[PDB]
């Protein structure tokens, strides 16, 4: 996260760290959507151009965290994965279309003040929140700047959703209905972006109708980080919800 600030304790209790078993390293963010399911970006798990192809036994998740690298005794919880599901139409060859994956935990996690699931939007929530100029919030432990670095605790920044024609005009990469973009315009006089290492983490919005946090997006891609005239791209959760529901129903 670029130009954000340190999270408060328990501010993002659905935030999940995806961690490679060996060598031990932070891969990506992710989010907790029930006691057994964790949502992330598909490219965190599968991206052949960078020789990445992780399965369940390569990985673990860490839930409840605030410090990036310290093991937070008696707070954080660590889960093995029973299974990984990548969207079958995830397009890594071109533009990361459908950059979404589900990970099923081997055992349900026990909730706490630090560990609690986010809501997924229904059709009505998505229609009313996902509008140009409304702000949501991104969180992560990724880079503080483009590299050409690492925070010591979870970072947060709030960013406005951007009009689709402005998103489309900002890049040559083909934008689809499975994506949206967020970030200030050059002249807007605020800054901030997600960055490398933030993929998989949630773009959330707080409903003014019921006071609940909804995950509208997943950090997916960008060109550089926090550049003027560029914006962060996010997987559109509601658009892929039939697939999320299909996998949780069937498995």
């Amino acid at each position: 996260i670029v130009e954000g600030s340190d999270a408060e304790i328990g501010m993002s209790p659905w935030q999940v760290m995806l961690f490679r078993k060996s060598p031990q390293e932070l891969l990506c963010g992710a989010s907790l959507i029930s006691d057994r399911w964790v949502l992330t970006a598909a490219h965190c798990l599968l991206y052949p151009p960078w020789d990445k192809n992780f399965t369940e036994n390569d990985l673990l998740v860490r839930i409840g965290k605030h410090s990036r690298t310290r093991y937070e005794r008696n707070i954080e919880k660590i889960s093995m994965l029973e299974k990984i599901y990548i969207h079958p139409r995830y397009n890594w060859r071109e533009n990361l279309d459908r950059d979404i994956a589900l990970m099923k935990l081997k055992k349900p996690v026990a909730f706490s003040d630090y560990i609690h699931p986010v809501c997924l939007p229904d059709r009505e929530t998505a229609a009313s929140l996902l509008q140009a100029g409304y702000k949501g919030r991104v969180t992560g432990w990724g880079n503080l700047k483009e590299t050409w670095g690492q925070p010591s605790v979870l970072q947060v920044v709030n960013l406005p959703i951007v009009e689709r024609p402005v998103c489309k005009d900002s890049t040559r990469i083909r934008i689809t209905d499975n994506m949206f973009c967020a970030g200030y315009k050059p002249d807007e006089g605020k800054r901030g972006d997600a960055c490398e290492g933030d993929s998989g983490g949630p773009f959330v919005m707080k409903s003014p109708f019921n006071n609940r946090w909804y995950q509208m997006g997943i950090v997916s891609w960008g060109e550089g980080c926090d550049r003027d005239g560029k914006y962060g791209f996010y997987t559109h959760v509601f658009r892929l919800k039939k697939w999320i529901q299909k996998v949780i129903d069937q498995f």
Binding site: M11, P13, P117, V118, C119, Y134, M205
Partner: peptide
């Protein structure tokens, strides 16, 4: 269930430091 309602914020009637900025953006 109580998805989306944070134990240390909405459940205690406490606001975090920047959520008002999100609420204001809807105005």
């Amino acid at each position: 269930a109580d998805c989306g309602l944070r134990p240390l914020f909405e459940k205690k009637s406490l606001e975090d430091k920047t959520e008002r900025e999100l609420l204001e953006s809807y105005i």
